[PDB]
Scaffold this active site. Structure first.
Site, PDB file in Angstrom:
ATOM      1  CB  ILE A 130      -0.930   0.166   1.083  1.00 50.36           C
ATOM      2  CG1 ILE A 130      -1.445  -1.480   1.749  1.00 50.36           C
ATOM      3  CG2 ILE A 130      -2.116   1.028   0.946  1.00 50.36           C
ATOM      4  CD1 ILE A 130      -2.354  -1.565   2.665  1.00 50.36           C
ATOM      5  CB  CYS A 131       1.621   3.786  -2.362  1.00 59.87           C
ATOM      6  SG  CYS A 131       2.624   5.536  -2.492  1.00 59.87           S
ATOM      7  CG  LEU A 132      -1.871   5.494   3.753  1.00 57.40           C
ATOM      8  CD1 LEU A 132      -2.920   6.252   2.898  1.00 57.40           C
ATOM      9  CD2 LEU A 132      -2.545   4.493   4.613  1.00 57.40           C
TER      10      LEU A 132
END
Ligand SMILES: [Zn+2]
Ligand SMILES: [Zn+2]
Lengths: 67, 149
Positions: free
Chosen positions: B86-88
């Site tokens: 997840i790119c967060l």
């Protein structure tokens, strides 16, 4: 009665944000957030709450302390 | 005295008492350092009706470092790749001990409703998203039915 919910929420609010074991007794300067025991505070270079730089940690005796 | 254990136990108890909408989490295995989470796709997202399973792995110096959170369920989304990464921001640079797995789960939900095309892990999906949103939703829905139902 359900004073228990209030009293426990208060007690848990006095616990170090990081280790969740020691009573809070330190403030980050200059920002003033007061969320950690002395050991966890010494290891945070920026404030966990506001992300302000920590110039230094000041010991605080929480007025709400028991013993 | 290096125990992330107390912080994890406290988060677990707090999250389970007041869980984020669309979400669930609990410990998995023997490992206190592992949780499983579940997200039911929000109603106003291409992922409605879909059930997504996530692993939560706490590093040994948690919460000085963020938890490792990944989808095990396959998903069509610009901010989540085929490895489930997840790119967060708050899972990387913007982590702080003030945040919680609960708050991250909420942000992932937010990300399902409103993908961030400016943070692509999956370039070609991010542009299908910006170029043609209607085909995006079509594909997002198809993948939900196929892999998350
Ligand atoms: Zn502490
Ligand atoms: Zn601060």
């Amino acid at each position: 009665r359900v004073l228990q919910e209030k009293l426990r929420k208060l007690k848990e609010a006095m616990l170090c944000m990081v280790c969740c074991e020691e009573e809070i007794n330190s403030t980050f300067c200059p920002c003033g957030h007061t969320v950690c025991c002395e050991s966890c505070a010494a290891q945070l270079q920026s404030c966990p709450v506001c992300r302000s730089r920590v110039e230094h940690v000041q010991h605080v005796y929480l007025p709400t302390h028991t013993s | 005295g290096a125990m992330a254990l107390k912080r994890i136990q406290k988060e677990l108890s707090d999250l389970q008492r007041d869980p984020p909408a669309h979400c669930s989490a609990g410990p998995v295995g023997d490992d206190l350092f592992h949780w499983q989470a579940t997200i039911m796709g929000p109603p106003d997202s291409a992922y409605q009706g879909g059930v997504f399973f996530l692993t939560v792995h706490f590093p040994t110096d948690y919460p000085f470092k963020p938890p490792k959170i990944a989808f095990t369920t396959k998903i069509y989304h610009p901010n989540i790749n085929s490895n489930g990464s997840i790119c967060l921001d708050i899972l990387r640079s913007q982590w702080s001990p003030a945040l919680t797995v609960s708050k991250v789960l909420l942000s992932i939900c937010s990300l399902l409703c409103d993908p961030n095309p400016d943070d692509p892990l999956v370039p070609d999906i991010a542009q299908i998203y910006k170029s043609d949103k209607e085909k995006y939703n079509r594909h997002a829905r198809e993948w939900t039915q196929k892999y998350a139902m």
